Design a protein around this ligand. Structure first.
Ligand SMILES: COc1cc(Nc2c(C#N)cnc3cc(OCCCN4CCN(C)CC4)c(OC)cc23)c(Cl)cc1Cl
Length: 266
């Protein structure tokens, strides 16, 4: 065991946030001072080793725009402990009561933050492999953080968010994350709508390999849809870096859309 271990007794669960087929997620407190999120093991439901690989990844990654690992407890019951993101997933946020008030300036900034965290992922030679709005967490002041590193891996599957070469041939790279980032941009510009509306998984894969790409979202400026389409280039190496994405989105309203006016929804 390493320096991430803590004593269970210093963890107290309070408020339930969700369950799955491996355990649960609770709000809670740490050493009676610090608000945390705790992720639990339904003890015999899965191999605790592989249940903690999500923490092994989080130990190595540390960035302001990635959700921070706080501690692990490697003896049953088992926990992972992280900072607490007050507004939950970005997906829920966008669909929620606030989502409708968000306009393009806020959505591009959020996407800029996510790109910033992924740019870090990029230069660390990792791939996330599950980038999408459901796996971005939100705090106050519209802070967005990449989360859920379950499938994340040092570089050595829902087709809607996954690049083709990765879904078909298992070729996951930082460039298939770039693809997913392009899909995530349509989640932001639609306030959370599922991609490829009205298409089932098979139709998505068939159409995407046939060159089909989602059209420009209502009120989304074409320059932002260009960006999406660059993220969705057939050739992975011709997709932009997270470094380009971050800088492009940070400067967006001066360098690309200086004449932007708000409309009905964006
Ligand atoms: C601990 O370990 C892990 C925890 C997580 N997941 C979370 C992390 C992290 N990280 C941080 N913060 C979280 C906050 C949540 O909900 C906040 C309250 C919801 N409300 C919506 C309605 N409004 C009005 C009140 C707020 C939440 O809900 C499910 C999950 C969280 C992941 Cl993904 C992986 C690991 Cl290993």
């Amino acid at each position: 065991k390493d320096a991430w271990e803590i004593p269970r007794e210093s963890l107290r669960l309070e408020v339930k946030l969700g369950q799955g087929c491996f355990g649960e997620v609770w709000m809670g407190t740490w050493n009676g001072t610090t608000r945390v999120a705790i992720k639990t093991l339904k003890p015999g439901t899965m191999s605790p080793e592989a249940f903690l690989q999500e923490a092994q990844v989080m130990k190595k990654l540390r960035h302001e725009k990635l959700v921070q690992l706080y501690a692990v407890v490697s003896e049953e019951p088992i926990y992972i402990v992280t900072e607490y993101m007050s507004k939950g997933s970005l997906l829920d946020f966008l669909k929620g009561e606030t989502g409708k008030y968000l306009r393009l300036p806020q959505l591009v900034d959020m996407a800029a933050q996510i790109a910033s965290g992924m740019a870090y992922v990029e230069r660390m030679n990792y791939v996330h492999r599950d980038l999408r709005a459901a796996n971005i967490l939100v705090g106050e002041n519209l802070v967005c953080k990449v989360a859920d590193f379950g499938l994340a891996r040092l570089i050595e599957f829902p087709i809607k968010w996954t690049a083709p070469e990765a879904a078909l041939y298992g070729r996951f790279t930082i460039k298939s994350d770039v693809w997913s980032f392009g899909i995530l941009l349509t989640e932001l510009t639609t306030k959370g709508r599922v991609p490829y509306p009205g298409m089932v998984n098979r139709e998505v894969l068939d159409q995407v390999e046939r060159g089909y790409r989602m059209p420009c979202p209502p009120e989304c400026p074409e320059s932002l849809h260009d960006l999406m389409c660059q993220c969705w280039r057939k050739e992975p190496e011709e997709r932009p870096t997270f470094e380009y994405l971050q800088a492009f989105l940070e400067d967006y309203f001066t360098s690309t859309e200086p004449q932007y006016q708000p409309g009905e929804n964006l």
